[PDB]
């Protein structure tokens, strides 16, 4: 049984970062050579394991998270980071054991006029627990007046679109990210 890593990396759509997908991987054999020998993965950093030696190890579960962020923000998909992605969208644990890979997805995820499908959380009153992610849409109260479920002044929709534009510098382009956890 090949572990369905093709379904994750060669997926048609990816998820928004505030709503990142997770695929549990159980009861199979996975070929990690096909990953480190890919000219496409601009980021391939591994924590607690060595990338080559990943075909010689066994775990009781493997988790596969996928989402889209800005290249400037792949810096935050690492243990011990802060910022709007790490704090309000996707948080890794300090004791992470796994790998994080990313690759420029300008050709599939940006268009002229801007692709607005991808979203991130802008407003949250408290930092996110690791692997603990909320799908909520309640508008954010930034004043002392209750908002009563109406978007307005000091009463902001908590999500914001990346508006991926094709022309921008590299740091602003969409990057698809896959996080492998080993437990």
């Amino acid at each position, epitope marked *: 049984n090949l572990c369905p890593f093709g379904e994750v990396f060669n997926a048609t759509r990816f998820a928004s970062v505030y709503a990142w997908n997770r695929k549990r991987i159980s009861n199979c054999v996975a070929d990690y050579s096909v990953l480190y020998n890919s000219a496409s993965f601009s980021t391939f950093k591994c924590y607690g394991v060595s990338p080559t030696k990943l075909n010689d190890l066994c775990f009781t579960n493997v988790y596969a998270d996928s989402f889209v962020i800005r290249g400037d923000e792949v810096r935050q998909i690492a243990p011990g980071q802060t910022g709007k992605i790490a704090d309000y969208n996707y948080k890794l644990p300090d004791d992470f054991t796994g790998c994080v890979i990313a690759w420029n997805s300008n050709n599939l995820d940006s268009k002229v006029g801007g692709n607005y499908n991808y979203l991130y959380r802008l407003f949250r*009153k408290s*930092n996110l627990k690791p692997f603990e992610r909320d799908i909520s849409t309640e508008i954010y109260q*930034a*004043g*002392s007046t209750p908002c009563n479920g109406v978007e307005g002044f*000091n009463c902001y929709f908590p999500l914001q679109s990346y*508006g991926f*534009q094709p022309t*921008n510098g590299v740091g*602003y382009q969409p990057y698809r990210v896959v996080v492998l956890s080993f437990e």
Partner: antibody
Amino acid sequence: EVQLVESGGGLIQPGGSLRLSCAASEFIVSRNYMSWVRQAPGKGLEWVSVIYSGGSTYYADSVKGRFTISRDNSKNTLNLQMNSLRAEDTAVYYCARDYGDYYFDYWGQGTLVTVSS
Amino acid sequence: EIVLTQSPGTLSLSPGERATLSCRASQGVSSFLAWYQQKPGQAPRLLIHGASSRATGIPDRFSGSGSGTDFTLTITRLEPEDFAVYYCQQYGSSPRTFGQGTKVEIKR
């Protein structure tokens, strides 16, 4: 009805300490990105420090290790503790409501911090 | 850090005339640009964000253009209270940084 009011500016020795305070009226510092921005007399605008809605803080490289941003929730106050004050640091200091660590959409009147011997 | 260069440094026009301010960036900042207005003795005031979105209560004669490294702010029909200093501010990277300003003085 919305309002930001700074205080705590004044004259301080080089290498002294000073604690700026910004009192918010209608809108809650604890739930907001809050920032400090400064302006030397007859000069441009420099971003100093920010505090995220959820707690994270960031600083300009010129003030790391010397400034500390924080907030008093029971008094809806933004604060800046400034130690090891230099000449460079003489400026008008503004608190600003910061929209998502992007731009500054509401500013206080400012307070003047003169650091001279 | 993104270095923000504003020109012209000063600009003498007459009420009713058209103003075109420029702000060029040391490298790409996409659409992540804001413009501010500062009168002497008081705090700056946000005019547009995102290179082209008017802030709340900002009259329509103010308008923003540009993407990448070349941005312009345009006042259509200069009113006697539009004469101040205008700053650009990028929020695409690094420390957030401001331009050095542009004084819009009335010519008489």
